[PDB]
Structure formats: C-alpha cells, structure tokens
Amino acid sequence: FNGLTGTGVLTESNKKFLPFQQFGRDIDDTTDAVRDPQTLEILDITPCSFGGVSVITPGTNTSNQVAVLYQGVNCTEVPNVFQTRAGCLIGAEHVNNSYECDIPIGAGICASYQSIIAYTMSLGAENSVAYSNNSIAIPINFTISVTTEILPVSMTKTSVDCT
Amino acid sequence: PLSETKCTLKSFTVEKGIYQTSNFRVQPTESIVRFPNITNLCPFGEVFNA
Amino acid sequence: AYTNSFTRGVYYPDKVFRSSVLHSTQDLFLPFFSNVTWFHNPVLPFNDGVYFAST
Amino acid sequence: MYICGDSTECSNLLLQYGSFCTQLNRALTGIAVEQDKNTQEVFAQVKQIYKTPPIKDFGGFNFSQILPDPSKPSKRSFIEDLLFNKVTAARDLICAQKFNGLTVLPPLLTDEMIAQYTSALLAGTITSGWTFGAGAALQIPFAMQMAYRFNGIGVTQNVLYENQKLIANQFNSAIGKIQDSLSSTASALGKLQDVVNQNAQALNTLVKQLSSNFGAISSVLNDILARLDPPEAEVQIDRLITGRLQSLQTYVTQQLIRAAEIRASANLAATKMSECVLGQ
Amino acid sequence: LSSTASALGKLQDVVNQNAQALNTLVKQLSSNFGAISSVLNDILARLDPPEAEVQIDRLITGRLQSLQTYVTQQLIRAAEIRASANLAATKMSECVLGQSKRVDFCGKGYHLMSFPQSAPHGVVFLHVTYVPAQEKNFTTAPAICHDGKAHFPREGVFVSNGTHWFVTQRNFYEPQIITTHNTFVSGNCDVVIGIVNN
Amino acid sequence: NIDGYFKIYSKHTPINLVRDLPQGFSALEPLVDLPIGINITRFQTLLALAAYYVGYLQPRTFLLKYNENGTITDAVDCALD
C-alpha cells in the first residue's frame, strides 16, 4: 500500500479510522486494516484461506480408497462433498444413521468403512430404567468375568555419548 | 492422496486411521501496489525550456 | 514560576489504529505530575523536545 | 508458514536445517489426541445412555437444579448454564485461524455430547444408584438409595426414614445455596479460567514473538529480501529463522509440560468420577 | 488376546515412540545446519583449521540443539512412564495382594481377586469380577410394622413376589421369611413414609 | 526532533480555569511532519498585542488506552509510583 506489504483478501469495513491514521493493527500486533491512499476509503484484510489436509483411510489391508478432509476451510473454495464444523470432507458419503466412532473426524463426526461413510457418532444405546417409588430390581443370577488391562512400567534404557 | 500418505508415513502399508498431510494455501492471483497520488512535480520546465 | 502538569502531554506516537486495546510504548514524553514554567519572553533551551500550551 | 510464510528463499534455507518441522507437529498432534483421550476417559464411562423418568417422585428430594432443562435449546442443566456463562472460535462461521499458521482444532466431543453424558450419569445415579457402574442398572427408590448410602458411612437405616422430611429440605437448600454461591463468588472457577488464560497467553506470546528482531536488520522476511542482496539476506534471514524456531521450541515444550499436568488432573477427575459418582 | 490385533497397543505405543525419537535423532545427524557439509571428516579434509572452525562450530551447535531437544522430550516421556509405573504398583498392591473396594479401579463389576502377568516393558493384569445378570424386579417397602412397631432389615432389603413379603440380600435374590431374627425395630409406624403391614 | 524529522502535534479545548492547566485527559493528534534535517537547541516565542506554559520531554515508558473508536483517553506514567 505504502510500504506495508502482505498477502490477504481485502474488503471495505465499518471501522472508523481517524484522519491521520493510515493502517490498523490487531491485539496480537498483526495488520488488521488499511486505508486506501487514493480514495482514503477504509479497507479490511483477512488472511488467504489456509489449512491442513488430512487423509481418512480404512487401511491398505482393507481397501485402497480414502476420503480427504480439508481442515477449517469452506467447501465452496476448495480448488461426494460434505461440509463439517471441522472442515470440508470429500470422498465420504454423509449418512443420517449413527454408529460407534470408528475414527474421529472432529466436532462429533466420525468416519468408517462399509465405501467410507461419515456419520454423527452415537454416544451409546439409549434405555430408560423403569424407575418408581415402589419397585426394586434384584439379580437372580451372576456371571464371573475376567478383564485384562495392560500398563507400561519401563522403557528402553538408552545412553547417548554426547561428545 | 493415499500415495502421499504412504510417502509421509514411509511405509507401503497404512493401517486404519486418519493421517495428516502438508497444508495448502489459496495462492494470490495478482499483485496490487497502491501508492498515493502523484503531486508536486519537480519544476524541470525552466531549466529545459527557459 | 512553576505549575504542575497533571495528565497532559499524551500524544499518538504513531499513525496506527487500535481499538479497545491497551498499548505500551517507549518514547519521549512529559512525565505526569511534573513542574511546568509559567511565562508572560526569553530564549528557552531545547533539550530534545518540548511541550507548549497557552490560554 | 510460522517460521516464514510465502518466502521460497527462506523455505529453502530452512529445508536444509533438519527435520525439526516434523517433530513439533508430531508433538502437538500427540497432545491433541491426548486431549481427546482425556475427555473420553473422564466422561465416557456409561455404556447405555440412561434418561430420567418423566415423573419426579424422588421422596421429596429435588434435583431440578442439576437435571437437564427441557425448555433450554442446549438441554444443559441450569447450573451447567451458570458455569458456561461465568467462564470467559468457530462459534458461528469457521474462523479459527490467524495470519501466521496457527490453527485450533475442534474437540471430538461437542458440548452437547458432554452434556448428554453427564445427563446419563445423573439419571443412572438417581434411578439405579451405584449398580449401573458395575453391571445391569437396577432401579431402586431413591429414598432407599439414600438409606443404603447412610448405612455405608455407619448409621443405621432408621436414621434416614424418620428424618427423610428434614433431610430432603437440607439437600434442596444446599443445592440452591450452591447455585447462589457459584453466581456470587468471583474466583470460584479460577482453575478452568487459569488454564484458558495460560493457553491464550502462550499463543499470544508466540505470535508477538514474530515481531521480534533477534539481531537481524529487520523483522519482516520480505523487507529483508527487498533491501539487501541475496547472500547478505541469507545471513540475515538465518538469524530470524533460528530465533523463530527457538521460540517455537519453547512453546512446544511449555505445551508438553502443561499437557502433562492437565493429564494428571484428568486422571484424577476420572478417578473421582468412577469412585464417587459411580459408587461411594 | 491371541486373535485381536492391537490388543497390546499401549506397550507398542511406548516402544514406537522411543524408536521414533531415536530414529529422528540419528536422522538429524545427516543435516548440515547450514555448514559446508554434514560430515566432519569431509570438512576436515577439505578446509584449513581456522576456516573449518566456523563450519565445525555451526555443525556442533545444530547437533547440540537437536540432542538437547531429544533429551528434554525423553525426560517428559520418562515422567509419563513414571506415573504409569506408580499406577501399576498401586494396582498390584491393592488388587493383587488385596481386594479393592474402590469401584472400577480394577475392572468393571465388583472386584474379586486379580492376577498379574508379565509383558516386555509392562505388566498385564487379569481382574476377576462379579457381574450380576437376569434381573427380576419386585415391589419394595422401606420397612414393615407389626404390633405397632416398625421393622427394618439388619442386612438386605424387603421385597414382595406379588403376594408374600421376603427379606433378601441386595446383590443376589435369596428370599427369606421375615423374622425378628433378621430385622430390628425402631419406633412406631407413623413417621416412616411408605411402610407396609405384615 | 527525530533523526532529521521535525514533528508537531496539537489540540484545542475550551476551559473555565484561569490559573493554570486544568485536569482531564488530552491526547494530541498529529500535524504534518517536516524532514528538515537540521538540529535545534534553543527556541523563543513570537508575541503580539503572556499566558503560556513550557515543559520538557523525557524518555519514558507508558501504557495507553484506546477505545472502540480508536481515540485515546487514559494513560499510566510508568514511573510515577
């Protein structure tokens, strides 16, 4: 603009600069607005859409097809499609059913193989226990179950000669 | 994308999961230089035309 | 003579715009609650910068 | 992008600096997955999502203060709303990004799912007692659950039924008192407020660090590239890369330490849930 | 355990993390951190002492940075495994050498004995727990009064199969005839809400 | 003076006091800058037909408050107390 150099998408905004102020600044000290020196109109600057790309795969041992997630961005501007609070999904078909979360997408969405379906994860099977101020439930039989849990207690003792 | 996942994992077999990959940017399509108006030109006239 | 400058001498140090933000700066300023000379003439010194006001 | 964005020269100059940019992403991804595991571990203990009966003959006890509010859009349980309002984003449209490569990922479980989990735990505790934490959920009149919990501490059952009228009033008044205390006291939620403040402080110090000079002639990559020649720029750019990278290392290490202590806290919270909520 | 894949995922995770950290550490040895070359022998054969001292210095500082990053992360991980080992020791002492009353500390359900088994860099427990099933539900009453005095059960609960009233322990349906031998009295039956005659 | 630039700031305000500078907050917005490139060490006032004041600046750190409209009305003189 004058010496202010940067990259971003521009837009006129409602901010009211004083007559002498040339450009705005953010709380974190990043440029946040600019005054056009020809027509003196106040512009607003937003960073160009960037985000990380993730690959959702059921495993090569299962199938060589995957679904891709573009974090954060909007499907309208990505150069089956499904917009989510976590990002844009492509290659995964959204279904209204719910299931146990196979692998997590984010914001309550999970994906799993079937052809890669994306669904709102189920917290569990619902049931209402027949509560009453008068009735109690007692078990007439029992089962013995053996559960196994694994804990690490140590790790390889490595020494690196610094010199 | 599957091949890129293989490359980033450095394995020809990938187990079930979600993996990350290099990010992307909406590339800038042009440059925009916006210096203010030209004014108060130097008085070169007389030296060259007096 | 002398008079006390209470909370005057604040000036926008740069051409930047900040909204609702609290900023910090290092710059030449007139310290708050400082002595100021009352004048009705002579040639003053000029250290690096001065403050002036008039009724 | 954080160390130096849109600069091919600096990108190359950093390329031959090693595989650091992989270790940091790996550590942060591990931290994120650990956060997901923390929430799942604390809350996802019930197998079946129970739900409270429509009718509320709980022997005079009054859980309306803690049970989910049907009228509310969020279905949060009145007190939960007070908590959410007291504490200081992708809230409306996805905008969790900044000019410098810093992004925030969303949690696997949204607040609605956490609220459903806590509602299931409340319903199980109210109707079935501590049985649902062991096997099939066995319903039992809540007055009788309190009778058996009295017997646990070492007071005969009769001490309850005779005082049931008074005990119900004490319980309800105490719950209302908690509501009022949370509304009034200022530093009540300091423990959560401090973690959010610490994370915001870490991010802000990380971003403000970009404007630091680190002994280079300027703080902007494009500025340096413009004003000096390629080799002098390279030696100047190198100083910026080292400083930026060291700052990022410090941030990652601080995050790892903080995540370790938060994991300890989450493990303690999971133990408290499992023991005191699902049992006595 | 034999069939399921990733049954031992936690020990695998520990080993994978350690091996990955070492692999990164050795890989960093290949990077030149801006020096002329990433092999000290190459620099020493190529350059004179005073000039080589610059390249050697840059290489040394880079390698030292990588090594201290590695050791810091290793300390973090060691603290994590220290916490895990403390938890494992507590579970050993409380659930193997005893019977944990604290619920769900050792497996779902009410806890019976437990058995330890060794794993390469960890321990595997086998928690034997008592889990009820086949739940029949009855009607109950907090107390029953008889001759004007209220009776409560010494241990167990009152239940009726629809026509007759019984005392049973809470965790297993064993009905018994209500006698003055397994109940105790406290006052008359006006203050008790929900009392029944019998 | 700044390494060749001569800066001038100013403000106006009507007051009731007649003794000396009143209290209240006043932030000086800038006027145009002059790149003269020549030192200054003295100065004196032109007069016509008496009630003016003079202070001297000093290096110092401050905390400045901006409101929603970008105007400054608050300050902390960081060595006052």
Ligand SMILES: *[C@@H]1O[C@H](CO)[C@@H](O[C@@H]2O[C@H](CO)[C@@H](O)[C@H](O)[C@H]2NC(C)=O)[C@H](O)[C@H]1NC(C)=O
């Ligand atoms: C810079 O020059 C442009 C072009 O002459 C000016 O734009 C004009 O501004 C007037 C108002 O002063 C408008 O009525 C015209 O419609 C504008 N025309 C165009 C083509 O822009 C602009 O105002 C000048 N600004 C400065 C600061 O000198």
Ligand SMILES: *[C@@H]1O[C@H](CO)[C@@H](O[C@@H]2O[C@H](CO)[C@@H](O)[C@H](O)[C@H]2NC(C)=O)[C@H](O)[C@H]1NC(C)=O
């Ligand atoms: C309690 O549960 C056990 C386990 O299901 C029952 O034992 C089974 O009984 C059936 C019918 O006699 C046999 O066919 C099975 O072989 C038994 N299983 C085992 C593992 O031995 C038992 O009958 C149940 N008791 C009650 C009273 O319901």
Ligand SMILES: *[C@@H]1O[C@H](CO)[C@@H](O[C@@H]2O[C@H](CO)[C@@H](O)[C@H](O)[C@H]2NC(C)=O)[C@H](O)[C@H]1NC(C)=O
């Ligand atoms: C000096 O005089 C020359 C010639 O008279 C000027 O150049 C001409 O200017 C007129 C009016 O702008 C143009 O229509 C012609 O096309 C120009 N001709 C040439 C050959 O330049 C010139 O503008 C005057 N001033 C200066 C500074 O050179």
Ligand SMILES: *[C@@H]1O[C@H](CO)[C@@H](O[C@@H]2O[C@H](CO)[C@@H](O)[C@H](O)[C@H]2NC(C)=O)[C@H](O)[C@H]1NC(C)=O
């Ligand atoms: C449970 O307690 C709540 C308040 O703790 C009761 O709700 C109040 O009811 C009274 C009488 O109808 C109203 O005047 C209040 O406005 C209510 N308060 C709120 C916050 O809604 C509720 O009635 C109690 N339930 C029972 C069964 O006693």
Ligand SMILES: *[C@@H]1O[C@H](CO)[C@@H](O[C@@H]2O[C@H](CO)[C@@H](O)[C@H](O)[C@H]2NC(C)=O)[C@H](O)[C@H]1NC(C)=O
């Ligand atoms: C992706 O972008 C679209 C629009 O580009 C968002 O949908 C709405 O679009 C209309 C028309 O442009 C706007 O007036 C609305 O404000 C937009 N919605 C919102 C919430 O702002 C769509 O919401 C975007 N994706 C996401 C996940 O928000």
Ligand SMILES: *[C@@H]1O[C@H](CO)[C@@H](O[C@@H]2O[C@H](CO)[C@@H](O)[C@H](O)[C@H]2NC(C)=O)[C@H](O)[C@H]1NC(C)=O
């Ligand atoms: C536990 O009690 C419930 C409630 O009485 C039983 O379920 C009811 O069974 C009757 C059978 O005549 C039905 O008419 C009701 O519609 C049922 N109600 C509900 C809410 O399910 C249940 O059968 C009892 N438990 C067992 C194991 O039988």
Ligand SMILES: *[C@@H]1O[C@H](CO)[C@@H](O[C@@H]2O[C@H](CO)[C@@H](O)[C@H](O)[C@H]2NC(C)=O)[C@H](O)[C@H]1NC(C)=O
């Ligand atoms: C509830 O239990 C009582 C006691 O066992 C049952 O009454 C007895 O039933 C047996 C078997 O039919 C008879 O041999 C006895 O003569 C009955 N009376 C007594 C005093 O034992 C009663 O039938 C049970 N009720 C239900 C609905 O199962």
Ligand SMILES: *[C@@H]1O[C@H](CO)[C@@H](O[C@@H]2O[C@H](CO)[C@@H](O)[C@H](O)[C@H]2NC(C)=O)[C@H](O)[C@H]1NC(C)=O
């Ligand atoms: C369980 O709740 C029911 C319903 O609230 C109670 O039944 C009421 O008992 C009173 C006793 O004075 C009667 O006046 C009502 O007519 C009954 N209502 C119905 C619908 O039957 C029952 O007493 C409660 N039982 C216990 C043990 O608390």
Ligand SMILES: *[C@@H]1O[C@H](CO)[C@@H](O[C@@H]2O[C@H](CO)[C@@H](O)[C@H](O)[C@H]2NC(C)=O)[C@H](O)[C@H]1NC(C)=O
């Ligand atoms: C249970 O026994 C009590 C006590 O007898 C009954 O309550 C009253 O008892 C007095 C004295 O025995 C009688 O004169 C009344 O007729 C009884 N009834 C009432 C309503 O006062 C009670 O009715 C018996 N049954 C139940 C279901 O409680």
Ligand SMILES: *[C@@H]1O[C@H](CO)[C@@H](O[C@@H]2O[C@H](CO)[C@@H](O)[C@H](O)[C@H]2NC(C)=O)[C@H](O)[C@H]1NC(C)=O
């Ligand atoms: C900041 O500036 C805005 C306008 O740029 C002022 O808002 C006006 O306030 C007055 C008084 O309340 C209203 O009558 C106007 O409708 C508002 N809008 C406009 C466009 O004038 C505001 O008062 C200024 N000060 C603060 C502290 O916000």
Ligand SMILES: *[C@@H]1O[C@H](CO)[C@@H](O)[C@H](O)[C@H]1NC(C)=O
């Ligand atoms: C691949 O899948 C098959 C079928 O489920 C299974 O038998 C086999 O063990 C799997 N192999 C690997 C390496 O996971």
Ligand SMILES: *[C@@H]1O[C@H](CO)[C@@H](O)[C@H](O)[C@H]1NC(C)=O
């Ligand atoms: C899911 O439900 C929506 C309506 O909310 C409907 O438009 C869509 O066709 C449904 N798709 C599936 C796969 O059920």
Ligand SMILES: *[C@@H]1O[C@H](CO)[C@@H](O)[C@H](O)[C@H]1NC(C)=O
């Ligand atoms: C400066 O002002 C203070 C406060 O009124 C006063 O005590 C002091 O004597 C003054 N000194 C001078 C040199 O003006």
Ligand SMILES: *[C@@H]1O[C@H](CO)[C@@H](O)[C@H](O)[C@H]1NC(C)=O
């Ligand atoms: C100011 O005076 C110094 C000597 O004290 C001189 O070196 C310098 O060039 C002068 N600068 C200006 C702008 O007058």
